[PDB]
Design a binder for this molecule. Structure first.
Ligand SMILES: [Cu+2]
Ligand SMILES: [Cu+2]
Ligand SMILES: [Cu+2]
Ligand SMILES: [Cu+2]
Ligand SMILES: [Cu+2]
Ligand SMILES: [Cu+2]
Lengths: 336, 336, 336
């Protein structure tokens, strides 16, 4: 398409929402290609990532870790306004793995504090894709400080199985997983720093161990548990998008399955089926479709259970509905 | 099916055998759905895991690491009697990744020492699947102390390739891989503890390094080597089921291939073919089908060769038969 | 085929070239099966792997890390002459993951300094495959000292997509990724050793951490950057073969995609498509096909960005041609 042709396309104008929720959208595209407009502001801010008050100097798109999920359809244009407030201290940019050219957009979006930029790309490939900040020379430090999220480029006809039959979800959640590398003093106690730059040298040394101190969903241990558990009902169809911008993960729904899993995240690659535990390499997003069949609590984890239970990578679903004794029953309850 | 309908199905009544062997079964289902009955008892016991006499306080289904492979067919019911002897000190339960509901069955099977329980689930999905103990708050500690194994849910028509043609094995082996985290004193020597609870605090600290001290097959360095090597003949078709309940692995048959590999473990996901080294994420089982073409020794390894050769993850096959010079020949033997 | 039948086949006689370049070959086979002849000599030599002058006692096929890519077609015979100079101090051999029998050929090729050997195998399976040295009892030490590479066994009809349509590349590159484990003194400074044997004990201890000090492409930090960047033009079709003999990797072309990716490396396993970041397990090769659509610099990385940016796993492409504003445009350049 020419400049005039793109300028003539309909616009929309989307208000991004905080994960794990996803902004309103339609599974099947409404009409022809659009220029879909998104705005994000980068926040440099202290966050608490565990129950012991561990503080990190986050970088965070729209103030959240992960940044929000942007949803468009194949062959739409995604037009992002990115704002770096003058109160920030660092240059930031954005690399969309969905995009083609200029280091994912990183080369065209380097904004110092007090600057903004608008990037447009054609979403030519359907799938879920990571995005992250990527300032030359300080790439992993921004990413593992929280500056990453994902987008979903839906097929224009929505999702399908391997034989071309429709898969339509009732709800969608976006789980971003973050590996954090928090320095410790000689006594083994997590360190606090007055300014983010004070933390840099110490942080790189921990990063070089390739051993995170915390691996969390939605930015903190227990962020998707308790009152903040995800929810569903028996019979409900749920898409769970999962991303990890820097490090491998292996999602597992404890008590369920991934009925269909695009483990590569790419919708033209047929989904795996009946999955127990799927695998998403660092630098990618994946997505799993599941129909709940049993009510109760479910845990959704990185199935390195040390990472899940000791380091923070565990979420919950609370599911309403009627128990199915055919699928599972206690024939004899625990008894002496 | 209703309660009366399930109660009316034929029963069987399987005697589990120690890995890497697998209990008698039929590849193609014999008749309609059955309730297949299994019993396991959990043993808390000291085991030796290497050649230097390193001792671990195991937890072990039927006294082995891994626990035994249970084989049923799709849409059978698996009915497990699980017994926790009064001489044990800890509560245990079981999560079947093949099952749907109540945290894989974990929520319905919490048995203290001196208790038993019977769980029944419908095996709705064909594949190989991990099972493991999962007591709330001490999940990875039980799993990496040895309390895991796998099941196989065969399609009712047995295994097939990607074009629907039968794949029938002559023999099957189950290789369970276990990551152990053994504490060391200030001198670097592995520690022994009088009681398992004495080892807990020290063990968690090693687990949090995400760096195992030992990665072993069938519960010990060299457990599947020497007199205990697996065996085959040229022309024989072998299924090798492999599981890892907590950590990634990358199996490789040195001198062979995975002719067909269900790397996800799930039989409705078509197998990869002609594999050199396949990948199984922590929290999953996978399976590889191979027809031996050459006699001699083979090594079967986790192809992180540090894990294989330094940490224990190596097994052998001894294969009988006639050498094939077409496939491989020494044109000039090593010579000055 | 019989001995006389193989002896009667046409020969060729290939001169191996240094990575990332690949020796001349034809995508579609020219005529019937051939015996394709390759010669490599193993060099034990000091190399510098980073910008700070870090020295390793390499072992290196034809003096390079990785060793060169050998290209044959399915059902050709690969006949390798392997030479271990008398100035070397260690026995070496070779395991071809493409081969069937005798530990990949390792059992038939053990050559002491001053010896040579000639091994022939039938390349029965199409794909890219790792090869590496594998001396009993010192396997990972030779591999992670640099003694590995890959081969490509092309289908006789060349490459195809999932629907059988031809995929013909304009150029091919071979990226070998190497994990190095370099000892440090108490002050944290990398150690130099007079003889390779002096480094052994210290090296094993670092290897057992499973934490590499360096993860590099083509044998050194920045080896495929600057003047040594790979190159392409807009519209050009490029195959990128990637191998890792010991450890997982997750390749990503920053600013592009893997249009078709044989992530398992095996051509009879249909390629994934539209990939952002693919995954190659340790002990395997994979291959990605991409048509460049935008000019400029691209980074090609292991997308654990700590491994990429801190440990060395990053390469560049410099791509000529006309910018495509449809695919991507800066609507508003960075501005206050
Ligand atoms: Cu940034
Ligand atoms: Cu990226
Ligand atoms: Cu237990
Ligand atoms: Cu589990
Ligand atoms: Cu060697
Ligand atoms: Cu190998």
């Amino acid at each position: 398409a020419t400049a005039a042709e793109i300028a003539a396309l309909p616009r929309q104008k989307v208000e991004l929402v905080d994960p794990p929720f996803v902004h309103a959208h339609s599974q099947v595209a409404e009409g022809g290609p659009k220029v879909v407009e998104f705005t994000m502001v980068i926040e440099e801010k202290k966050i608490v990532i565990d129950d012991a008050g561990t503080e990190v100097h986050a970088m965070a798109f729209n103030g959240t870790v992960p940044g929000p999920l942007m949803v468009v359809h194949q062959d739409d244009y995604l037009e992002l306004t990115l704002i770096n407030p003058e109160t920030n201290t660092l240059m930031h940019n954005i690399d969309f793995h969905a995009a083609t050219g200029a280091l994912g957009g990183g080369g065209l979006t380097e904004i110092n504090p007090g600057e903004k930029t608008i990037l447009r790309f054609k979403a030519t490939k359907p799938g879920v894709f990571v995005y992250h900040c990527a300032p030359p020379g300080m790439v992993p430090w921004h990413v593992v400080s929280g500056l990453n999220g994902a987008i979903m480029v839906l097929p224009r006809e929505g999702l399908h199985d391997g034989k071309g039959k429709a898969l339509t979800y009732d709800k969608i959640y976006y789980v971003g997983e973050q590996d954090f590398y928090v320095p410790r003093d000689e006594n083994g106690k997590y360190k606090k720093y007055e300014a983010p730059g004070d933390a840099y040298e110490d942080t790189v040394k921990v990063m070089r161990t390739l051993t995170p101190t915390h691996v969390v969903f939605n930015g903190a241990v227990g962020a998707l548990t308790g009152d903040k558990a995800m929810t569903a009902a028996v019979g409900e169809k749920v898409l769970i998008v999962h991303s990890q911008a820097n490090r491998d993960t292996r999602p597992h729904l404890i008590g369920g399955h991934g009925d269909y899993v695009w483990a590569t995240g790419k919708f033209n690659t047929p989904p795996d089926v009946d999955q127990e535990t799927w695998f998403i390499p660092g630098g990618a997003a994946g997505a799993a479709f599941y129909t709940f069949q049993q009510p109760g609590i479910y845990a959704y984890v990185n199935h390195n259970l040390i990472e899940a239970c000791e380091l923070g990578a565990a979420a919950h679903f609370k599911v309403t509905g009627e128990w199915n004794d055919d699928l599972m029953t206690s024939v004899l309850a625990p008894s002496g």
